[PDB]
């Protein structure tokens, strides 16, 4: 069964066969589309199919499908699962697995880079302090003094679900949020809850607008422990505008390294509950969302005021006009400081290229339109005009519940 | 089976129960989401009639009444005897208002109940259609204080006597492929323009030529008519601060009136049912003016503003996009022709969503279409989960007639 996607700017038609390899559900039925819904212990029995399917993919990719080495590996895993109920990935399989989770991440616009990923095998890790050292090295390697490099650190897999490694931070580097007695928020409102947890655990909050949160690290199902990332390892960029000299006086800055730390990596049925990964920002992530969401730093008003726009009526498009200048500022700042960043024209154009290549070479590219289209200027980016097919391939990055909701406290 | 939608900006959660009354299929499976694809007999008719009339009689709070049973019987007798049935005026108006109500791709639905329905089921010729259409245009334009309307021509019979408006909108600009190699006018209309010329239209060959209507009655060959020029309200585009903007020579029409869709009410098919509301500014400024395959004017505007077009990262496209849109709104407001900006329209739709959740148990909405093509996340709909499903009565796409019509 062939499926066709069309681009309404170019009339290019592509044909998807890869969707035939999807197994996981989408959330949609023949009767309902949930395309815009944000979030729509395994047995021996269920594990070996998942192992076998993964190893078959791995062996095809290395052109060793059906080989003695492929067959031995299958039997070895079968027998490992039979006697221990789980199995260990070879290093080569882990790397391949992590690259594929990224390749399959349908909400990621940066996927052209999927093949260049530094994998840090942290499976020998046993303690939170151990995790801290791994994460510091990941932060330093990936930051590379502004010349950012994609990387992922993979801590030991779930066993019985009572021994999970988890990073409680949603990103390795993020700013504290503080709810005040008067209902206002200081810092990042997205991070108030986790900030509170950090404080409760013993962190001494500076209580400013850009405090880098401590890492809250859980090893082997134990209670989590706090660590300050060395500040000299935390690369930040002060935000200024090329023509507006008052912009710097807003006091904005941002960190250079986006590193998602709250997701679950699934490879061959095995579950890697701590697997922080990082790439580099697309400018709109900061300038549109983190700065201009009403539930984030919400700076549209202050900027518009400083620009002396007509704010009496929405139809003067003041919000839209402030928005462009803020994003120009973010891109200008990062580039002036030689910290990697990609604008949304460049990133979406790169993605279209990657996506076509993927159709030719792989028979598809699952893509979530709702997520891939940038949150400003949607239709002047080629992705807006691009029909996409969204479906679930393994290996994959999954969401998982926040740990404070599930963790069994040891004391 | 009962479904939650969350707003991620406000944390308000609504519970959808309306999707269980869902009839048509979506394109999506449990395996694959097609949310971003643009186009994903007597025994058939009687359930469809029953379903609609049950909902109608429920709406005037007379469900299961004698008058309800009587009508079901009447319609049933009529279908068995004539293979079809006719809607009472009341059922037609309610059907039209509700097709708009169910239009999951329309952000303007807070207005759904204020709709003028012109019953044109007594029309028999293309000339009649032309008269009805002019009258719709004039009524809806209303010297710029636009008013929503639909004109409804006779329903499909044996499918060989369809009424069709061949135009995609009542009012559109022509598109011409030139010897040069470029396109003059609106590239989206190039093919339909050729059909006008081949049918006999005398094209003025300009950038903003209003197309002639190509009207088909009773399955006959379509015929050409020019809308009286004095009935087509248009707006010259100027910017409140860039005096040079006028020199681009841009204009647009005030009346957006979609003419190529099919209205389905209670299993009956109204294949000619032009309907109109009024524009959201981004439709013209972002899509019509800046789409690469439309008038594609970003480069020229950016050139006049003296932006650095050396690199994508100066956001010169984005800067010019905002200005082009400020000019559209400003020009329409200055001429007192109804227009709505994307902030105001999306805010309205959110209020409408809440109304429909609390009074109906849901509101089908297509997020891909609802979120404006500019500044998406600074409009509240961007943050609003939406469930998309298909309810009837409905507006539906249908194949262009030049592929269907046997001359
Ligand atoms: C190298 C440059 C990269 C760029 C420019 C990029 C771009 C993006 C953007 C803009 C998002 C959406 C962020 C949001 O809206 O919150 C995203 C999401 C995502 N990316 Fe990337 N990405 C890059 C690298 C990576 C890497 C290295 C991985 C993993 C190895 C990855 C996997 C993912 C996943 C799983 C998501 C979904 C996150 C979520 O759903 O919250 N990306 N990407
Ligand atoms: C009164 C003010 C109205 C506003 C502000 C409005 C807004 C919109 C917008 C922005 C779209 C998307 C159009 C596009 O992107 O091409 C749309 C589509 C649509 N609207 Fe409206 N609309 C209005 C009136 C109406 C009326 C009167 C009807 C029916 C009687 C209607 C039914 C529809 C339908 C069926 C679509 C989908 C058309 C398509 O798929 O191309 N709307 N509307
Ligand atoms: C409700 C809606 O799905 C939600 O706002 C989504 C829309 N698109 C997005 N796209 C990106 N890249 N990131 C997001 O957080 C979201 N949020
Ligand atoms: C492929 C994609 O569905 C297509 O570009 C859609 C996206 N969203 C849209 N939204 C609206 N309102 N109108 C459109 O024409 C489109 N086009
Ligand atoms: C970690 C791989 S994906 C890299 C990326 N470009 N975005 C990650 C999310 C960042 C978030 N939107 C923020 O603005 O903090
Ligand atoms: C007719 C009911 S919906 C009214 C509307 N606001 N738009 C309809 C489509 C117009 C198109 N997007 C254009 O830019 O011409
Ligand atoms: Zn779907």
CB B357 within 8 A of CB B297: no
Whether residue A292 and residue B377 make contact (CB cut-off 8 A), yes or no, is yes
Please name the helix (run of DSSP H) or strand (run of DSSP E) that holds residue B251, with its range, or none.
Answer: strand B251-253
Distance in angstroms between the alpha carbons of the first and the last residue of chain A: 55
* B140 SS3 class: helix
Of A129, A217, A207, A202, give the one whose Cα is nearest residue A165: A217
Q: What distance separates the 2 farthest-apart alpha carbons in chain B?
A: 74
Half-sphere exposure in the Cβ direction for A334 (13 Å, CA):
28
In this structure, are residues B297 and B277 in contact, taking their beta carbons and an 8 Å threshold?
no
Max alpha carbon distance in chain A (Å)? 74
What residue ranges in B153-247 does DSSP mark as E strands?
164-165, 175-177, 183-185, 213-216, 223-225, 234-236
Burial of A311 (0-12, 13-18, 19+ CB in 10 A): middle
B210 vs B230: CA distance, rounded Å:
12
User: Is domain A16-123+150-160+264-278+348-372 annotated with CATH 3.90.340.10?
Assistant: yes
Q: SS3 sequence, chain A?
A: CCEEEEECCCCCEEEECHHHHCCECCCCCCCCECCCCCCCCCCHHHHHHHHHHHHHHHHHHCCCCCCHHHHHHHHHHHHHHHHHCCCCCCHHHHHHHHHHHHHCCCCCCCHHHCCCCEEEECCCCCCHHHHHHHHHHHHHHHHHHHCCCCEEEECCCCCCCCCCCEECCCECCCECEEECCCCCEEECHHHHHHHHHHHHCCCCCCCCCCCECCEEEECCCCCCEEECCCHHHCCEEECCCCCCCCHHHHCCEEECCCEECCCEEEECCEEECCCCEECCCEHHHHHHHHHHCCCCCCCHHHHHHHHCCCCCCHHHCHHHHHHHHHHHHHHHHHHHCCCCCECHHHHHHHHHHHHHHHHHHHCCCCCCHHHHCCCCCHHHCHHHHECCCECECCCEEECCCCHHHHCCCCC
Task: Out of B283, B316, B323, B363, pick the active-site residue.
Answer: B283
CA dihedral sign of residues A110, A114, A118, A122: positive
Q: Say if domain A124-149+164-235+399-403 classifies as CATH 3.90.440.10.
A: yes
User: What is the structure's resolution, reported in angstroms to one decimal?
Assistant: 2.2
From residue A160, alpha-carbon distances to A46, A84, A165, B201 in Å are 15, 11, 12, 76
Fold of B234-256+279-344: 3.90.1230
Domain A236-258+281-346, CATH among 3.40.50.1370, 3.90.1230.10, 3.40.50.300, 3.10.180.10: 3.90.1230.10
What number of other Cβ atoms are within 10 A of residue A117's Cβ?
18
Q: Whole-angstrom Cα distance, residue A225 to residue A199?
A: 12
How far, in Å, are A101, A282, A329, B92, B306 from residue A248 at the CA level?
Answer: 39, 21, 9, 61, 25
Query: Is B315 an interface residue toward A (CB < 8 Å)?
Result: yes
Query: Experimental method used, please?
Result: X-ray
* Dihedral Cα A332, A333, A336, A341, nearest 10 deg: -80
What class, spelled out in words, does domain B16-121+148-158+262-276+346-370 have in CATH? alpha beta
Fold annotation for B122-147+162-233+397-401: Nitric Oxide Synthase;Heme Domain; Chain A, domain 2 (3.90.440)
Residues B17, B4: Cα–Cα separation, whole Å: 9
- The one catalytic residue in A93, A225, A285, A325 is A285
Is-contact A25 B31, C-beta < 8 A? Answer: yes
B123: three-class secondary structure by DSSP: coil
| Alpha-carbon span B128 to B217, nearest angstrom | 9
Q: Which residues of A touch B22 (CB under 8 A)?
A: 31-32
Terminal CA-CA length for chain B: 49
Angle at CA of residue B128, ends B127 and B134, nearest 5° = 90
Note if B278 is an active site residue: yes
- Where, residue-wise, is CATH 3.90.440.10 in chain A? 124-149+164-235+399-403
Tallying the residues shown for chain A, one arrives at 411
| In contact, B375 and A323? CB cutoff 8 Å | yes
Q: How far is CA A89 from CA A74, A100, A221, A272, A311, in A?
A: 12, 15, 21, 11, 58
Residue A238 · residue A255 · CB < 8 Å: no
Q: Phi/psi zone of residue A269: left (φ > 0), alpha (ψ -120 to 50 degrees), beta?
A: left
* Ion ligand 7 residues within 5 Å by Cβ: A 28, 33, 35; B 28, 33, 35
| Chain A residues inside the 8 Å CB shell of B343 | 314-315, 319
Burial environment of residue A399 by CB neighbours within 10 A (0 to 12, 13 to 18, 19 or more): exposed
DSSP structure class, residue B380: G
Instruction: Establish whether B134 is a catalytic residue.
Output: no
Of A8, A28, A314, the CB nearest to B344: A314
**Measured CA distances, A390 to A99, B30, B140, B170 (Å):** 19, 11, 41, 36
What is the phi/psi pair of residue A296, to 5°? -120, -135
CB contact under 8 A, B377 and A378: no
Cα angle B393, B389, A388 (rounded to 5 degrees) comes to 130
Distance, in Å, from the CA atom of B157 to the CA atom of B45, rounded to the nearest integer, reads 12
Dihedral Cα B41, B46, B49, B55, nearest 10 deg:
-140
- CATH 3.90.340.10 in chain B is located at 16-121+148-158+262-276+346-370
Q: Which residues of B touch A289 (CB under 8 A)?
A: 377
| Ligand 2 neighbourhood includes B345 CB (under 6 angstroms) | yes
Nearest chain B residue to A21, by CA: B31
Domain with CATH 3.90.440.10 in chain B: 122-147+162-233+397-401
């Amino acid at each position: 069964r062939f499926l066709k996607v069309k681009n309404w700017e170019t009339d290019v038609v592509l044909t998807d066969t890869l969707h035939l390899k999807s197994t996981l559900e989408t959330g949609c039925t023949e009767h309902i589309c949930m395309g815009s819904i944000m979030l729509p212990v395994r047995t021996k029995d269920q594990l070996f199919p998942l192992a076998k399917e993964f190893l078959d993919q791995y062996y095809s990719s290395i052109k060793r499908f059906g080989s003695k080495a492929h067959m031995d590996r299958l039997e070895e895993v079968n027998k490992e699962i039979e006697s221990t109920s789980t199995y260990q990935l070879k290093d080569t399989e882990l790397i391949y697995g992590a690259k594929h989770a990224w390749r399959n991440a349908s909400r990621c616009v940066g996927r052209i880079q999927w093949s260049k990923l530094q994998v840090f095998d942290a499976r020998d890790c046993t303690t939170a302090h151990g995790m801290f050292n791994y994460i510091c090295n990941h932060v330093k390697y990936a930051t590379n003094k502004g010349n950012l490099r994609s990387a992922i650190t993979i801590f030991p897999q779930r066993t019985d679900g009572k021994h999970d490694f988890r990073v409680w931070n949603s990103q390795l580097i993020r700013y504290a949020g503080y709810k005040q007695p008067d209902g206002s928020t200081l810092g990042d409102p997205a991070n108030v809850q986790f900030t509170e947890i950090c404080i409760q655990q013993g962190w001494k909050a500076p209580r400013g607008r850009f405090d880098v949160l401590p890492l809250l690290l859980q090893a082997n199902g134990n209670d989590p422990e706090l660590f300050q990332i060395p500040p000299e390892l935390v690369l930040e960029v002060p935000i200024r505008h090329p023509k507006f000299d008052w912009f710097k006086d807003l006091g904005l800055k941002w960190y250079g390294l986006p590193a998602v730390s709250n997701m679950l990596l699934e490879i061959g049925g095995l579950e890697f509950s701590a697997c922080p990964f990082s790439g580099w920002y697309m400018g709109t992530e900061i300038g549109v969302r983190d700065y201009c969401d009403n539930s984030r730093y919400n700076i549209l008003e202050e900027v518009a005021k400083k620009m002396d726009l007509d704010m009496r009526k929405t139809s003067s498009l003041w919000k839209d006009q402030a928005l462009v200048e803020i994003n120009i500022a973010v891109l200008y700042s990062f580039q002036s400081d030689k910290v990697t960043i990609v604008d949304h024209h460049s990133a979406t154009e790169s993605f279209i290229k990657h996506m076509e290549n993927e159709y030719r070479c792989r028979g598809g590219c699952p893509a979530d339109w709702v997520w891939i289209v940038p949150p400003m200027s949607g239709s002047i980016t080629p992705v807006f005009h691009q029909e996409m097919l969204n479906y679930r391939l393994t290996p994959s990055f999954e969401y998982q519940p926040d740990p404070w909701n599930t963790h069994v406290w040891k004391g």
